[PDB]
Design a protein around this ligand. Structure first.
Ligand SMILES: Cc1noc(C)c1CCC1CCN(S(=O)(=O)C[C@](C)(C[C@H](C)c2ncc(F)cn2)N(O)C=O)CC1
Ligand SMILES: [Mg+2]
Ligand SMILES: [Mg+2]
Ligand code: NA
Ligand code: NA
Ligand code: NI
Ligand code: NI
Ligand code: NI
Ligand code: NI
Ligand code: NI
Ligand code: NI
Ligand code: NI
Ligand code: NI
Ligand code: NI
Ligand SMILES: [Zn+2]
Length: 284
């Protein structure tokens, strides 16, 4: 049966300052891509990510302490989100999960290549059902879905428990090329299924009361290549000077993080990017 992941989205002061008025549309744009990934048939389940609440923190002290140490930020965030959840799921703004988004670059013990953070198997535990996402651009939509994967009991696809069943899927242990034709591995598929068959989706059974509408356009529609570049490299960056790799300014100096342009991104009159390819908007 149908599962509804009622979610609170939280943005820290770094996000408020960076994004200004456009902040809530941007989080919703992230979450809508993540919501799509969870509807892909390879998850082999019926999962609906819905937003019941959004908090923006304009003053550090009114939110959790966000530090570059990712494990500690997650823990800070988890503690802090408790107080803002209504007790019973009868309440409309009661959430099953909470996600923090920050511009601060998050770090492990060893490098600052951390992109997000969550514990495994926590989705209906109100005090552990959280994630922190570093916002380095639109690709943070896939970070959002990966970490939500942890929350749903998915291990990384190199875990020994995944040997029997399966680097190119959502739950890769490191950033690599996603297979957009099959986002979730057989392992991810099984580990979420097991979890729900074991009864751990219980708080996901109730439908949301007037959820915050997610954008139904493509992320490239709201955000053109210059915007995309700015989300990654700061407001002074523009598109370089197509689709497969987004290059951005920094002797013309240009830089990339190797991601394609967001789907729906204008690549000329009557054409737009779809899975790394520039194609006519009108399809046959
Ligand atoms: C962008 C993007 N575009 O497409 C995709 C796909 C992405 C996301 C790629 C993911 C790579 C791996 N991570 S990561 O590199 O930040 C490492 C780490 C913080 C390790 C921690 C220890 C850890 N936490 C929990 C565990 F269950 C295991 N281990 N992680 O896995 C966090 O979940 C996060 C992001
Ligand atoms: Mg509150
Ligand atoms: Mg795609
Ligand atoms: Na980081
Ligand atoms: Na970094
Ligand atoms: Ni503001
Ligand atoms: Ni909007
Ligand atoms: Ni601080
Ligand atoms: Ni595969
Ligand atoms: Ni619920
Ligand atoms: Ni400015
Ligand atoms: Ni400027
Ligand atoms: Ni351009
Ligand atoms: Ni590089
Ligand atoms: Zn992970």
């Amino acid at each position: 049966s149908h599962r509804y992941v009622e979610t609170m989205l939280v943005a820290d002061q770094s996000m408020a300052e960076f994004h200004g008025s456009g902040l809530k549309h941007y989080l919703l744009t992230l979450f809508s891509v993540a919501a799509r990934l969870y509807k892909h048939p390879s998850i082999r389940n019926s999962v609906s990510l819905v937003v019941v609440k959004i908090l923006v923190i304009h003053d550090e002290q009114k939110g959790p302490e966000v530090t570059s140490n990712a494990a500690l930020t997650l823990r800070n965030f988890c503690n802090w989100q408790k107080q803002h959840n209504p007790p019973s799921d009868r309440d409309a703004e009661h959430y099953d999960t909470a996600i923090l988004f920050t511009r601060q670059d998050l770090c492990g013990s060893q490098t600052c290549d951390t992109l997000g953070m969550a514990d495994v198997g926590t989705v209906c535990d109100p005090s552990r059902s959280c994630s922190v996402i570093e916002d380095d651009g639109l690709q943070a939509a896939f970070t959002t879905a990966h970490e939500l994967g942890h929350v749903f009991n998915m291990p990384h696809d190199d875990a020994k428990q995944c040997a029997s069943l399966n680097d190119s899927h959502m739950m890769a242990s490191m950033l690599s090329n996603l297979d957009h034709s099959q986002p979730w591995s057989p392992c991810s598929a099984y580990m979420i299924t097991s979890f729900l068959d074991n009864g751990h989706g219980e708080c996901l059974m109730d439908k949301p009361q007037n959820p915050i509408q997610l954008p139904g356009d493509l992320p490239g529609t709201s955000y053109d290549a210059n915007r995309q570049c700015q989300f990654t490299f700061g407001e002074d960056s523009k598109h370089c000077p197509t689709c497969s790799t987004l290059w951005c300014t920094g002797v013309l100096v240009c830089q990339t993080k190797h991601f394609p342009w967001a789907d729906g991104t204008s690549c000329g009159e009557g054409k737009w990017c779809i899975n790394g390819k520039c194609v006519n908007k009108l399809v046959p």
